[PDB]
Every structure is written in C-alpha cells, then in structure tokens.
Amino acid sequence: VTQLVEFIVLDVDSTGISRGNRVLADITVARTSDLGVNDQVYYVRSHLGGICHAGDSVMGYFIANSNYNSDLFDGLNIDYVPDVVLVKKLY
Amino acid sequence: GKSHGYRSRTRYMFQRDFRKHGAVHLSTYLKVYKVGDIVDIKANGSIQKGMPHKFYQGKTGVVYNVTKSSVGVIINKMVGNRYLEKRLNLRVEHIKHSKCRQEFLERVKANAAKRAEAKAQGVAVQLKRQPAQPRESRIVSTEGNVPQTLAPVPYETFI
Amino acid sequence: AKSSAYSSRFQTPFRRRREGKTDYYQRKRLVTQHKAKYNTPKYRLVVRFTNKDIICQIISSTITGDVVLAAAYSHELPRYGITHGLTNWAAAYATGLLIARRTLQKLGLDETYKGVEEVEGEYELTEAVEDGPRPFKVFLDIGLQRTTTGARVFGALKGASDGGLYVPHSENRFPGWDFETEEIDPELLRSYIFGGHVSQYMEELADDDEERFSELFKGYLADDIDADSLEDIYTSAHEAIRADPAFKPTEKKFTKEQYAAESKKYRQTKLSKEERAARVAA
Amino acid sequence: QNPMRDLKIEKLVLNISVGESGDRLTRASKVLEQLSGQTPVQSKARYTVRTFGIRRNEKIAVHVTVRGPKAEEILERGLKVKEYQLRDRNFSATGNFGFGIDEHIDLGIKYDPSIGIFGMDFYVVMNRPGARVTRRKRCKGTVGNSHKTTKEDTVSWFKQKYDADVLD
RNA sequence: GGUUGCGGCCAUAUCUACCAGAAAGCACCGUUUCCCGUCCGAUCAACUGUAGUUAAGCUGGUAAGAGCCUGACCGAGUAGUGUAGUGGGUGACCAUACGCGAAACUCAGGUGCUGCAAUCU
RNA sequence: GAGAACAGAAAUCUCCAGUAGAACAAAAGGGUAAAAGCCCCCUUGAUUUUGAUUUUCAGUGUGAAUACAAACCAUGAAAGU
RNA sequence: AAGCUCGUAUCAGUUUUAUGAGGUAAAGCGAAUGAUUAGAGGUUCCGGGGUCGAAAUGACCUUGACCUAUUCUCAAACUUUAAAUAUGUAAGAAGUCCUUGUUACUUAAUUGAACGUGGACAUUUGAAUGAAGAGCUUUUAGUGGGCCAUUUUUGGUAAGC
Secondary structure (H helix, E strand, O other): OOOOEEEEEEEEEEOOOOOOOOOOEEEEEEEOOOOOOOOOOEEEEEOOOOOOOOOOEEEEEEHHHOOOOOHHHHOOOHHHOOOEEEEEEOO | OOOOOOOOOOOOOOOOOOOOOOOOOOHHHHOOOOOOOEEEEOOOOOOOOOOOOOOOOOOEEEEEEEOOOEEEEEEEEEEOOEEEEEEEEEEOOOEEEOHHHHHHHHHHHHHHHHHHHHHHHOOOOOOOOOOOOOOOOOOOOOOOOOOOOOOOOOOOOOO | OOOHHHHHOOOOOOHHHHOOOOOHHHHHHHHOOOOOOOOOOOOEEEEEEEOOEEEEEEEOOOOOOOOEEEEEEHHHHHHOOOOOOOOOHHHHHHHHHHHHHHHOOOOOOOOOOOOOOOOOOOOOOOOOOOOOOOOOEOEEEOOOOOOOOOOOHHHHHHHHHHHOOEOOOOOOOOOOOOOOOOOOOHHHHHHHHOOHHHHHHHHHHHHHOOHHHHHOOHHHHHOOOOOOOHHHHHHHHHHHHHHOOOOOOOOOOOOOHHHHHHHOOOOOOOOOHHHHHHHHHO | OOOOOOOEOOEEEEEEOOOOOOHHHHHHHHHHHHHHOOOOEEEOOOOOOOOOOOOOOOOOEEEEEEEOOHHHHHHHHHHOOOOOEOOOOOEOOOOOEEEEOOOHHHOOOOOOOOOOOOOOEEEEOOEOOOOHHHHOOOOOOOOOHHHOOOHHHHHHHHHHOOOOEOOO
16 A cells, blocks of 8 residues: 555546446546646546546556566566556545 | 674764764874874764774774875784784774874883993993882981871761 | 853864854865875965955964965055055955965975966966976965855965966856856956956046045045056066065064063953952952 | 944835735735835745645745835835834834734825735844844854843834834 | 964863953945845945944953862772682671772862964054 | 734744754664755766775675775865765 | 694783773762653544545544643663773884985975885893793594583572573
C-alpha cells in the first residue's frame, strides 16, 4: 500500500459493461506531480467506473518506473502490462 | 543482535570538551611534522574525515610519510602472541607532538654541553642520571622550637 | 536578568570574532600550507579599506604572530603627487602598484619582472621568465568585504598584477564585465584606472547643479584642477612609483617618550586593595 | 545631551493581511503600488491552520516598506484619518508606534470599484543616527543604553510634532 | 603610553549597571552620475573628507555585583581504592598492616597577557 | 516579552532578549552558528586507470571507510574544496 | 624434534624520571538533562489503524488528536570536577654536531626535504635491576565437552544454578 501514487483524473469514458461496479470506464488520467509543468496524459481501463468524475484525486500503482524483482513478474509478456492500475479514490 | 561498527562504544571518547566546542585554533595547522618525529594521537570529534579508529586513541607512533593534509603514523598493536606494525593516515587535527621526546632533545644538548665544558677542565664528566638517594645525616635545631606533645582524642558523635 | 546557570555554561567565542574583524572559516583555508613544503610561508596580500584611507600589506604566518614583510598606505600618495581622492578606485590601483614595486625591491626580483608599463586595462597575468627565477606568488585576502564586480578591492589587485606580483585572478569581477557575453571591455576598464569615472562626473554636475560643485570637490577648486587634467595626474603618478618606492619614514617629532609622557595623564589607574577596602569601610 | 541625539522616522512598513490568496491578493497589491510608488513584495504562510482556511506557502499577504522623506508624507496622511489621536496603547516598549486603519477609500486617491475595499496596518519604527552599528557587517556591536529609544521618549516626541494626543 | 591594520593564546578577555576620554587614528555622518545590488542607496556597491559631531561604537575606570582563573597547616590524609592474614562478625559489613589518595564546600588573592608593521603631544 | 483594521490560543508585520533549549531523509549516540541549519547562483567528482592503508581479521574474503599519484573536469575573484 | 647463522646481542608479564590517554568508585542536584504508580473533560484546533459506500454535504466504530491547572522522587542507558589498580611512548652509535655534495621533488631564491663525502665526540655511550646465551627457520603429534576459589559483577526468590 506504501507504493501508491496520487493521480488526477481528466474525464471518464464508460464502455457500458457493468457487472456490479460499472465495469471498464476508460479513465483518462494524468499524474498529480506532472500536471503542473508537463504535457503527459495516460489512458487506462479501470473498475472505478461510476464513482469517478473529472478533477478527482485517485491513488494508483505506477508500473512504468518500478523495477520489480519477482520471477513471476519477469515471466510475463511486457507489452501486455498496463502502465497504470487505479486502486482507490481519495477523500 | 550484536554491534561492532566502526565507531561503537565511543560516546564519551569522541566528545569535544566542556566550553571548547567550535572550530579549532590555528596553531594546530602551523606546526611542522618531519619524518621520524614522535607524535601522540588524540582524535578530534569535529573533523570527521581522516579519523583514527577507537583503538589508537592515546597511543604514540612515528611519522614516516608526509602528504598534503595528513601524516603517516606507524603503531605497534599486539594481537595473539605477536606485535604487528600497523600504519595509519591521520589528518593534522588529530595529531600532536610528544613532550617526552622534546625534553629528550634538549637534554642531549645539555649533555653535549657538559662533556665539552668538562674537557676544558679535564676530569669528571658525570653525565648519567641517578634516582633518588637516601638522605644524609643532619642536625635539627630546637632553638626556638619545643617539641609539642600530642595525644589521641576521645570519641564524640556530633552527628 | 541573566541566570547564574546561563553564564556558567557559555562558549565564549574567540577574541577576533566577537570584535567582528576576522572570519575564521576563511582564515583556515588561507593560512595552511601543503605539508610537504615544511617551512614555506604563504604570503597574503591583505587589502583593507577604512573610510578616507587604504591599507595594503604583505604578511605571513607564525604561531607567535603574523609577520609583516612590506606595506604601504594611501596617505603616502601625496609624496607621489596624488593629493585629493586618496580613497577612490584609482588611488586603490596606485597603492597596489606601490606595494608591488616596493616588495620586489627589498626581495631582489626588481630588475626582471617589471610587469606591464604601457597599461591599457587588458586581462593578463605575469609569466615566468625563461631560465630564470620564478615570480613572487602572493594570494589575495579580502576579509569581510562583499565581493561584487566593480569594487575598490580588485583595483588594488590590478595594481599588484601590473607591478609584477603573481596574483591568481579572473577577469569577471573587474568593472566593465558584461553579463550576457563573457568578455571584458578593455577600453572601459582603462577609464577607471586613470580616474575617468570621477572626471566624467565633474562634467555633468558642473553645468546642471552648481550648488553642490562648491561643497563637493572643494579641494579641486582650491588647487584649480579641472576635469581633463585628472587623467594626467595618475599618468605622472604611476611613473613616479617606478622611480623610487623606497619608503622613507618620518620624524614624527622629538622622540617617542614624549608621546608616552602625554598619554599617561589621561588614562585612569587602578585602585589598590586597601584603598578599595577603605571605600568599603565607608 | 542634545546635539546629535535626535529622533527620526527610519522606515514605514505598510501591511495588508489578506485572508486567502487569489486574484483578491493581487488586487490588494495594486493598492500599495499606487500608494507607495514601489513594487510590493508578497509573504507566504508558515503553517496550515485550516480554521482560517490557509495552507503552507500560499502567498497569503503583501507588504511594502517606505523609507526616506516619502515615509513622512504617507504618515501624515494616515494620521489625518484618525485626527491625530492614539490610545495609551499603540506605543511599544522599544519605542516604536503603529496603528491600523480600514476602508482605504477614505484617504488617498479614489474609490475605483473594480479594485475593492481594503484595510491597512501602518507600523513606524524610530531610532537615532548611529543605528548603523547593529545593521552593518564588520565590527558589529550594540548601541549603549542611554542612546536607545524608549516608550516615554517617543510619546514626548509625538506630542510635540503634529499636535496629537495619547489621551487614554 | 594612546590608536589602527594583521594576529597568537581563547572569559583574569564575557555579562549587567553608571562614569571619563586631549592629540591623532577609528566611528557616526553627506550625496546617487557611473560599476553594482535591493520591495526600500537600511544592508553591500560607488562618490566626496566636503556640511557637521564624541551622542553611540571603541578604549579606560568604579562595583564587599553575577561569572570565570589561580592557590592554600581549608575541607581531608576524610570518601574511595591496590596488596595480606586459619583477623572480628550467624551475617550485613567493620577494624588493622604496607601503600596511592580525591570531589563539593570554606577562606584569601586576581579581572587579559603579548608578536609584527605603521602612526600619534 | 512588548506593539499593528477585521484578527481571538494559533495567519501577516516590527523590535528587543535569545550557547543552540531548533534544524540537519531515518534508529540512537556524537558533531556543527558570518555553519554541517534556512534562502538564492552555477554545475555532475555519484567520472577514468589501477596499487597502498584502516575496521571485523586467520592479518584471507565480502561490505563500508581514509590518505595519495597520473588523467580529465565542476565551482570560486582567490586560497582551496 | 631436526637444527641453522652467530655468540654480547640488546631484549624483559618489573620499577623510576619525564610525558600521554580514559570517564568506573567516590562526589554534585540551590550546574544542564530526569523518569516512575495513576488520569476526569473539551465532537471538522484530526482520522492515525479500520470498516461500508452508483460517492461525499460521509456514514459508522475507535485510538483520541488535545493535558488545556499546579504537586514530590534521583539516576546502569544524567552530568561541570575526578581517583586507585591496569595501559601507550622516550632514556642516544641506526646518536648529536660542524662542513658541502646529489635530484626530474620543493622554494621568489642553492630555500627546504631526503640520502651521503670529509672532520669532531668512546669507555659513566647518557636511569635502576636481571640476562642457564641472542636471533631466525623447517616440520609434525595431541587438544578444540572443562571445572573450582577470593574479588568485580549480569539473569534469578535463592541454589553444589
């Protein structure tokens, strides 16, 4: 839980699939630390479908800079690993 | 778990002093160390670079190497059944001269002075030192001096 | 209203520090010698500016005390023709020329290493003569002066470099250094050396505000020295320094002991213990 | 004695304690700019209290200092607002005096409804010549006790000029 | 003997309260064109030694002051401690023999000393 | 501690006192005041080549560390680091 | 155990003269630092650890954030001063002094540094006592379960623990 990174959501694009949590809203999200002076925007499907709106602070795992050392993570297909996993909405 | 770090058990030995904190005075740097001089080691707490280990606090060595900021000192340390000859590189704040050697160098000049002076007279060089002798017989004076009588005191509490 | 415990535990700082004169973090880096030299003293050009006076010295280090090798002051310049303005930028250049030609005379490196003489205000430092003795190397000591470009301090440095002393320095704190391009203006630097920045201001204040031209610059009007002749003052002055930087002292009066016979009268003396005990008794 | 032991009005420190940052802070800055004639500097918060609504490093307040002859003229215009009348307070034990007003449209230039209404704090320091020795770099020292300013000396000075009252 | 520049040793030099200082040196002080730096020529920059001052800084003195530093048939040869005994004591611990031996306190005295270069009734 | 509109226990501003009672990524112990803390300006020496030396020690390893030499640079007006 | 080079060599579980280092016993709390046993309130002056939420003006539970008033204690993990016993080095010939040789280091400089030529200082040659010789080397056996006593102590009620 100590690896969570603050994210700021730009908008929510839902695909209309919903099991019990409004499945697969393609959230366009940007980093809290890079929103100020950068132009860098990430693009990710997530289960946080209905509870998320524009300008909300969410927490997330950030795979793009993390060098894990698991043999299970090493035995994957890297180009199928997402850059962002949205974990929970803050406040 | 045990603790055997590089500065363990040095709480009171690397403290600076009482009312002597702050920067060092400039006659520490201006002194001159030539190869072969007898030096003493006392680790300064404020200057962390080039610092002697906690063993060599208080030992005494000989300077063999002189470099920019530091001096090279040899120390005889015992281990097991044998002396070894270990070498250090101490910055000049931690080092200081030994006055026992400095009194030796001026006693040689006095010993050379007495031999050359006694040769002009011709006898009795008399140059070795002698320890404390038992004293000679002498006569004390009771003139204006009566021997005062003492006695043991009784017991009182006054507590 | 200070407790007895407060004065009990009190690191009293060093004597030159609570008086506020000497930085000791700077002094350690200036004094120390590479220990493989064993004796070689590190000579420090000490340039200190008071108001209305300029002090320049060449000193070394010893545990008993610092040893002065040679020194000159701003008030020796009326011997060399400079009367008024003996604390400006230009007189600071003349004093650094005076210590250099003096310390090369008493040392022996006088005939060689003449330095520049046709001075144009261009950054260069002295070069070692082929198959000869090396020039005398003196480092700069500034004390507590804030280092800003165009200062009076580096003018005393420029007189030292032109006199022949080896002083390591850059060209960026001289006046006329440009911020955008990293070059020096040699024409504008040559103005400051001969008092151009003062003689320019004698022009603008003349026609516009006559009221202050009597109050300021009054020594100029008394000797009738106009603005354009100010550049001719220092030009004759630098050649006067090359002739005889011999430092003859003065007579001061009859002797020294007449000075001590005066100053005893005005200082108070300590009372004795029994005279103190008589005052406690009353 | 008299001859150089004289009071003076060393600096005047205008202050506007804006509650929360924003464009309302920058509209307060243009008030001090047209008043003092200089560019004001802005101060940041030290801590986050959250009962006032502030956060750390927010550029919460502005202030500008005025020295020289221009400080006396702004001081005269401020005292006319309160009719040369101050309380038994407003004079510190060090000898300095200050007072705060509100609704700056009552003095000065104009109303100008785009910029709004603001209240200022005026604070005046007092010293004598020779106070350089505490501010300078080389040979720093402290001023002796008989040359220091007191509360009693300022009120004796402030009654003499401007014909004012400490009535409380 | 007094100042100033540069120190050495770093409170016998500091701290608090009042007083005195000729000469010169310092210091306050006057101005903002230029190099330069600030919200503010206050600090630093430059400019004049000019309009003026010992009011401050600085130096010297005084205080049965606070602090600090030396001593002493001061406390005390006491506290502790190294060796020895088929010594005492149910013990706890304590005496002796050959030895080393403090600290707080008490009183008495002290309140910077000096190196280099220059300049001063 | 004493002062300033709204403003109080706590906003911002000012002075006096202030031997570190603060701060220095973290455990505790050292250390530090014109700094080793706070705020600015410039930079990559957190680099290349291999030896000597300290600590645990069998005077082997491993980790960490000190002082140099030969190169190349950073910074500063400079000593230097 | 086999020996080898040498035989007054300078070494020594010691003292003295000189000079270092240390923070335990004792002292101190009217010199800094200082616990303990308990613990009542103040609802966005915080939430820290949760939990449920189609969300946040969002709920519920809890340690509380807060000690908001004073009150004693002394000290292995508190300190200005500081023992005793134990501990490091020096007491010369591989030394001191004149004198001038060496160099690519160093100095403004034949200044320093380092190593030397030639000359001078010997039986008291630089404190005491002792020295069944001093010094170096090769090679291999056994052992790697310990225990007791005075003193200093840690855990423990205490123990032939």
